[PDB]
Amino acid sequence: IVGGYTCAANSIPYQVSLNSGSHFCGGSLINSQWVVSAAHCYKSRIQVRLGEHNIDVLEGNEQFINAAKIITHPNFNGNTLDNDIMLIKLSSPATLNSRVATVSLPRSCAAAGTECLISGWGNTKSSGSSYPSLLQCLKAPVLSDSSCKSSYPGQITGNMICVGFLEGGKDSCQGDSGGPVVCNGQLQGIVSWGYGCAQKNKPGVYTKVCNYVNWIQQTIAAN
Numbered sequence: 001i002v003g004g005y006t007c008a009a010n011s012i013p014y015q016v017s018l019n020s021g022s023h024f025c026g027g028s029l030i031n032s033q034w035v036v037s038a039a040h041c042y043k044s045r046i047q048v049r050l051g052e053h054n055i056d057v058l059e060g061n062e063q064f065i066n067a068a069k070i071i072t073h074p075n076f077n078g079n080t081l082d083n084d085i086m087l088i089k090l091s092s093p094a095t096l097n098s099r100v101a102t103v104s105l106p107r108s109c110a111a112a113g114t115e116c117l118i119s120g121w122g123n124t125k126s127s128g129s130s131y132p133s134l135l136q137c138l139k140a141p142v143l144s145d146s147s148c149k150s151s152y153p154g155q156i157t158g159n160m161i162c163v164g165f166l167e168g169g170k171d172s173c174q175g176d177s178g179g180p181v182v183c184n185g186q187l188q189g190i191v192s193w194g195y196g197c198a199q200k201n202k203p204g205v206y207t208k209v210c211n212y213v214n215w216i217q218q219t220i221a222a223n
């Protein structure tokens with residue numbers, strides 16, 4: 001996250017870190033057994049880390065649970081990142097408490113200008129790289145489809161939203177991949193892609209979670 005703030009400890013209790021030796025992606029807990037992330041975060045072996053704040057230090061509230069099922073959207077397009085969504089079934093249910101909690105799926109799509117919270121352990125610099133120990137937070141609004149398409153001509157499908165600032169300076173970035181955009185208590189976006197980070201007129205692009213509620217529910221129901 002570039003231009004954000006350090007989140008207060010466990011203030012994003014649905015935020016998880018996907019680990020394959022080190023942190024490589026975020027994700028969001030949506031029930032005690034299921035995490036949603038980005039399909040471009042796919043790896044064949046993943047440990048889900050819940051209750052994290054400082055990802056480099058054992059603080060006592062962590063739950064480390066292996067990914068058992070790893071299911072990318074069947075229509076995920078690796079070239080365009082259309083349908084960039086992935087579900088992970090934990091090998092054991094997470095123990096839900098105040099520091100490890102689910103976030104609701106959307107009951108409807110978020111309107112442009114809706115304020116949201118983006119979070120993750122990704123790069124905090126728009127030039128170069130700095131990867132934080134502490135979870136980072138950013139308040140950012142949903143942008144209109146026309147503004148998102150003007151930012152990225154010929155690449156914004158109906159399954160993508162832009163969230164952020166056309167003036168740049170504040171954005172998700174590499175390593176935030178797969179993490180949450182939550183608006184009014186609902187997971188509306190998944191960190192998907194962009195042109196660099198926090199550049200002028202290149203806000204981050206996020207998977208439009210509201211398009212996938214039925215796919216998510218059916219996948220969980222069937223697995």
Ligand SMILES: [Ca+2]
Pocket residue numbers: 054055056057058059062
């Ligand atoms: Ca730890």
